[PDB]
């Protein structure tokens, strides 16, 4: 759970 | 209790370059990225761009393209940043974080002060 | 294709009521049930702190008075009740796509 990493 | 202490205030004059560092301890290291963030007196926050540990692997923000040079040392687990040919739209604080399980935790930041 | 967050610069509420920050994308952040949008909190002098996560999450030891809500392109961050440690600059932050975002902040004041 990253909130600065993006799916994909 | 998840810790990152961050290098101390820096001036600088004008088309240098200079490094900070961001001390990371509580996690391990190479398991999750560290971003970097620029803010500029009196203004919002930009996503500089991130380095997993494990790796050394970077990404960036476009922006900051040749600005900033993200580095990590899984040695002492620490993190850098390289800012280059500094004018004094680079003069801000720069804050570094990396998450665990949707909890971020920040630096206290960095001045950088570019001299005019 | 950078995602744009527009924010309003500045909120003056009174002391123990509402306050409503607000969050417009210019793009869809949405993304398989869950919208990639992140509040912040920062005092003056102080660092960032995290709020709100995924448009609805409370984060870790954040008080109950704080919420979240929105979907699509519009978002909300909510305070109820404002307490006298609440002035701060709020951000809303966007992870759909890199790169990472953040709107311009809103600056919450006390009506006097």
């Known amino acids: 759970g990253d909130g600065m990493v993006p799916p994909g | 209790q998840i810790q990152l202490q961050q290098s101390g205030t820096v001036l600088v004059k004008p088309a240098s370059s200079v490094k900070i560092s961001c001390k990371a301890s509580?996690?391990?290291?190479?398991?999750?990225?560290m971003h970097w963030i620029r803010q500029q007196p009196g203004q919002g926050l930009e996503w500089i761009g991130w380095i997993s540990p494990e790796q050394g692997n970077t990404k960036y923000n476009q922006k900051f393209d040749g600005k900033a040079t993200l580095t990590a040392d899984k040695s002492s687990s620490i993190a850098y940043m390289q800012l280059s040919s500094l004018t004094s739209e680079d003069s801000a604080v720069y804050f570094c974080?990396?998450?665990?399980?949707?909890?971020?935790?920040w630096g206290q930041g960095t001045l950088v002060t570019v001299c005019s | 294709m950078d995602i744009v967050l527009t924010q309003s610069p500045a909120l003056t509420v009174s002391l123990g009521q509402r306050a409503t920050i607000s969050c417009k994308t210019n793009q869809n952040v949405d993304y398989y049930g869950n919208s990639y949008v992140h509040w912040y909190q920062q005092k003056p002098g102080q660092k960032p702190k995290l709020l709100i996560y995924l448009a609805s999450n409370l984060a870790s030891g954040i008080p109950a008075r704080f919420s979240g809500r929105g979907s699509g392109t519009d978002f909300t961050l909510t305070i109820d009740p404002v307490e006298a440690a609440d002035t701060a600059t709020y951000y809303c932050?966007?992870?759909?796509?890199?790169?990472?975002?953040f709107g311009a902040g809103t600056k919450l004041e006390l009506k006097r």
């Open positions: 932050q966007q992870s759909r796509d890199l790169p990472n975002t």
């Open positions: 974080v990396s998450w665990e399980d949707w909890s971020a935790y």
């Open positions: 509580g996690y391990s290291f190479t398991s999750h990225y």
